Design an enzyme around this catalytic site. Structure first.
Site, short mmCIF file in Angstrom:
data_model
loop_
_atom_site.label_atom_id
_atom_site.label_comp_id
_atom_site.label_asym_id
_atom_site.label_seq_id
_atom_site.Cartn_x
_atom_site.Cartn_y
_atom_site.Cartn_z
N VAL C 63 12.17 -6.18 -21.94
CA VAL C 63 13.76 -7.12 -22.15
C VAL C 63 15.09 -5.77 -21.60
O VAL C 63 16.33 -6.12 -21.80
CB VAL C 63 13.59 -7.81 -23.84
CG1 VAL C 63 12.61 -8.71 -24.37
CG2 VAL C 63 13.63 -6.63 -24.72
N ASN C 89 13.62 -12.35 -30.38
CA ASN C 89 12.95 -11.88 -31.57
C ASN C 89 12.30 -10.60 -31.10
O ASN C 89 11.86 -9.82 -31.85
CB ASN C 89 11.47 -12.99 -31.71
CG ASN C 89 10.74 -11.84 -32.51
OD1 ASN C 89 10.10 -11.71 -32.30
ND2 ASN C 89 11.49 -12.81 -33.60
N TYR C 154 18.97 0.80 -36.73
CA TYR C 154 18.44 -0.81 -36.38
C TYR C 154 20.00 -1.48 -37.58
O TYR C 154 20.01 -2.21 -36.47
CB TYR C 154 16.72 -0.60 -37.14
CG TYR C 154 16.44 -1.94 -37.84
CD1 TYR C 154 15.54 -2.49 -36.88
CD2 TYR C 154 16.41 -2.96 -39.00
CE1 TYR C 154 15.43 -3.50 -36.42
CE2 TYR C 154 16.17 -4.09 -38.67
CZ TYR C 154 15.06 -4.22 -37.66
OH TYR C 154 14.15 -5.73 -37.35
N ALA C 155 20.05 -0.89 -38.61
CA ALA C 155 21.39 -1.76 -38.97
C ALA C 155 22.79 -1.91 -37.42
O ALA C 155 23.06 -2.95 -37.87
CB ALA C 155 21.81 -0.48 -40.29
#
Ligand SMILES: [Cl-]
Ligand SMILES: [Cl-]
Lengths: 247, 247, 247, 247
Positions: C63, C89, C154-155
């Site tokens: 990706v 995902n 990540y947030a």
């Protein structure tokens, strides 16, 4: 200075005999507002007159009674001119898990914490719109946004305050009146002082700041939104919760 | 007075040669902060020094370059002591509908508008945590919350600023450092001045206030969050958008 | 039946060899979709083909590589027709407190968890818009909304996914393409299975449901949004977190 | 199939004689629920019995009357067993700008759109908690989240519904009862059909989907949340608004 200066403004702060309401009334006065603070009884009203001195006065006000609202406002308007800043801080709790929650515990919370805002806002808005200048600031709660077990009534009223705020904000923005909510987290007050050590520690466990808020910290957020400098803020909920919830 | 008084604080404001960043830097200086404002060039740096005078100075800073960041901060720390207030205002746009959006238009936005906040925040946090006192305030955008067609890159970065802010707020709350975002709506700037009448009227149609905000209005919200009085506000996004959007 | 029936739809699910991605791919197939699931390796691709059987196939997809993206999609389009449903995902974690967080741990998160969504969405949107029909569904995280200490990267990426989603939703709504995010809380997976008892109990303390979610529960929310019945849901973030957070 | 199968569940849908409430009742029946739909009058109740046939029945219910609530539930419980799914859809509007808004227009909205939820939820919760299984789903409105001029009462009640939902969600999560809100945007109904062309076009101007919602689209979101597959969703507000608002 000229910074957050409220000289020339008339502020009505409900539920101002102690804690958050008192801090708000004192800070608005300190920034130059003429302040009318209210309490449920005359002795509270007098205590309010006592701490305000020449910067304003205390009045007895029943926020669930139209007649009381009409009388208090007439007296303000007669003496001081129209209200420029309304702070809706009067409020109560009637906690219970839903299955224990009485009809009256629900309805009293709705009347005192939500319907009051509708009545008081309505009573002041006309003059604000004609003058093309106003502030309505509602003291909400983190519980309105977060929810809390045992407080479904309080949460519903405080969330209701936001839906009202957003709608009114839209209604009156073009006329220079802002409408906003300040949403305290766990603030040190008589109610939080009466909690036992376990209860306080448990609640502090959910506050990243690792301490309770001070009433003056809520007052600061209120005076900020009350200022000329906050004219482009409307329909907002300003959270003052030590990181307890993050939207 | 003692109210929202930043005397003794050192503030770093990125992207401060004009508009919002300039307004921020000037207001923090007026409230007593020693202010270092940055620009991409030495001529901008000089213009910054010129308007700050004895209250601070301008420095050349490339927010996408670690070496520049290290050099600017060393200079600040040498002269002024550690940074107490960081305002991340540097940012750009690279608008396009997704099917026209170049790899580089996406990556430049991410680097400048989001990765910069990671780098600069990281570079100042250690001293803030040791001192048990700090403010990091990110200048975001209504677009980060609302979304906007033709600005999926900008929206993504600005929304990213909020996820970063919440996570950092949780990380450092117990050490007395707050981390917040101010989210302007449509603010009168050079960029908005270049828009044609149709575009401005169209955008004003979505603002209930019926005007553009002033850069000083954003400055006031930043100064409020930078103040001692705002110690119990963290992980928050303060919307200053004239009702364009209401959360 | 005719209810949430995906017969005739071609769905691309990235990161589908296990857990949530596998559950998604299996459910979309069970509701009638032709499903192409991807993995980083050929062995994962094969495992995907093995569980999908006659309902679709596995492909190797990087990706973060435009060339891989172009090759995988050409193959899909050649065999199956244009993609009607994209589920993004694929994603990773690179956790660390900010002062320990490497440049590469930040940039790898941004590339894999946010820039990927830009690339893959862009690669499928044209056919969706021409057909006047499409679904793009991003698998986000509660962390994007809540924030979490030790996961500022990540947030930031997951919150970025929401800004992107809202902007794209606005861009393509009139053409019958919806763009939404499903935001899992703490879901039982290999990653969560590797956590020790203390860590799991600590995290469960913040979930009112008092359990981890199942990957199938995330699959159901994705399948719902993928369905014809969800045509009027767009720009939305569907939280599936057992009450961990409430917006 | 076994997918979103409500066989064995007993569902109570208030305000089910037409539009959204009818669509909900029909879809829950189609998915296998025994459905009791309600209306204010017997003729509505009969119309409900007529469309439900062997899948359930219609009852007359005054949601602002405790006695009516107690009688309707006793009859359900006697015949069908305890309610497993409650859909609160009964609701009204009493629009006016604040300065024109009567005391009764405010109070009637609070009673019918908010207090009703408290009463009906309370009436069903005990059995759900004892069975360790339940769904309460409230049909809210985008206006609760967005605000709307001329609808401060409706907005306040609908936002109040969310504060209630979140608190109850917390209260009962550990006992396998979820509590959620579905928030429709502009859905085609008799009320929207009576609007003139100008009014409809004006409102469509704010919907990126460029069309009104169908009642069946709200029904789908309701049946989704009512399903076993949505057990890890609680305290959530699921927006079905064509992109009119994006949280
Ligand atoms: Cl910017
Ligand atoms: Cl992930």
């Amino acid at each position: 200075s000229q910074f957050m200066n409220l000289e020339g403004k008339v502020a009505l702060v409900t539920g101002a005999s102690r804690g958050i309401g008192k801090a708000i009334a004192e800070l608005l006065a300190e920034r130059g507002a003429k302040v009318i603070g209210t309490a449920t009884s005359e002795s509270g009203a007098q205590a309010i007159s006592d701490y305000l001195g020449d910067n304003g006065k205390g009045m007895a006000l029943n926020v669930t009674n139209p007649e009381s609202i009409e009388a208090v406002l007439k007296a303000i308007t007669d003496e001081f001119g129209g209200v420029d800043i309304l702070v809706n801080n009067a409020g109560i709790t009637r906690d219970n898990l839903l299955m224990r929650m009485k009809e009256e515990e629900w309805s009293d919370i709705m009347e005192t914490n939500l319907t009051s805002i509708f009545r008081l806002s309505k009573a002041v808005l006309r003059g604000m719109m004609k003058k093309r200048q106003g502030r309505i600031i509602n003291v909400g709660s983190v519980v309105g946004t977060m929810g809390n077990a045992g407080q479904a009534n309080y949460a519903a009223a405080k969330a209701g305050v936001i839906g009202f705020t957003k709608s009114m904000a839209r209604e009156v923005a073009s006329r220079g009146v802002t409408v906003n909510t300040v949403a305290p987290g766990f603030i040190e007050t008589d109610m939080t002082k009466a909690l036992n050590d376990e209860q306080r520690t448990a609640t502090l466990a959910q506050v990243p700041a690792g301490r309770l808020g001070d009433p003056r910290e809520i007052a600061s957020a209120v005076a900020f939104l009350a200022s000329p400098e906050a004219a482009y803020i409307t329909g907002e909920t300003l959270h003052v919760n030590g990181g307890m919830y993050m939207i």
